[PDB]
Amino acid sequence: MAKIGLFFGSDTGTTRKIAKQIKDMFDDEVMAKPLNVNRADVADFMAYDFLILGTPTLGDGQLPGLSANAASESWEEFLPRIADQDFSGKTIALFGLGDQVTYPLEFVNALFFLHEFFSDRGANVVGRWPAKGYGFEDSLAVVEGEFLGLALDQDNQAALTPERLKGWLSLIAADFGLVLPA
Ligand SMILES: Cc1cc2nc3c(=O)[nH]c(=O)nc-3n(C[C@H](O)[C@H](O)[C@H](O)COP(=O)(O)O)c2cc1C
């Protein structure tokens, strides 16, 4: 019913809180309430033509899920449920949570798997983010000096999250038809 679907994966609530912060900025007409992918219905997920998806990186640079030692199923188990769906015509923006100090070689790698998955199915992906403001040495989520989606780090750069969400949401505002609060 809402224009933008908002889904996330999360083990310790960090990504969930961010998803909520994002929703707090827009009206029910433009964006739906944040929902954990382990609660989502395929038909419910497939209805939106615009999607904002968030995910942390766990285990060993993996998507959250039971194989990554998450307390509950997450993106890992959800993707197969929609692997046969076509995402052509759908606009998707990704945000990832990670810890650049503790995992300098796999910073927000989960973003790559998410991007690859929807990209391989015709989705229009937007929201690349400059990688200069981060300290890391390697990442599957970096292409041409930019992260495949917004990168957030509540472990080391929590103070930067507000300006990053304002700036990033403004970046995908054109594609998504969003209007940021003053
Ligand atoms: C066992 C474990 C592994 C992690 N692996 C990575 C990693 O590979 N890359 C990364 O950027 N962050 C990694 N992190 C950091 C988390 O993604 C980060 O703390 C995030 O904020 C957690 O999100 P959540 O609270 O939504 O689960 C790891 C954290 C833990 C506890």
Author numbering: 1 to 182
Paper text:
They carry a non-covalently bound FMN (flavin mononucleotide) molecule as a prosthetic group, which is able to alternate between three redox states: a completely oxidized state (quinone, Q), a one-electron reduced state (semiquinone, SQ·) and a two-electron reduced state (hydroquinone, HQ). Rhodobacter capsulatus is a non-sulphur purple bacterium capable of fixating atmospheric nitrogen when ammonium levels in the medium are limiting. This microorganism possesses a nitrogen-fixation (nif)-dependent flavodoxin (Rc-NifF) of 181 amino acids, which is included within the long chain subfamily of Flds. In R. capsulatus, nitrogenase reduction by NifF has been proposed to be supported by ferredoxin(flavodoxin)-NADP(H) reductase (FPR, EC 1.18.1.2).
Rc-NifF was crystallized in the oxydized state, but, unexpectedly, the 50’ loop was found adopting a trans O-up conformation, which should favor FMN reduction in Rc-NifF. Rc-NifF presents a basic patch adjacent to the FMN-binding site formed by Arg16, Lys17 and Lys20 (α1 helix), Lys33 (α1–β2 loop) and Arg39 (β2–α2 loop). These residues introduce large differences in the charge distribution on the surface of the protein, which change the orientation of the dipole moment with respect to other Fld structures reported so far. The eight-residue insertion present in Rc-NifF comprises five backbone carbonyl groups (Leu66, Leu67, Ans69, Ala70 and Ala71) and one side-chain carbonyl group (Asn69) protruding to the solvent.
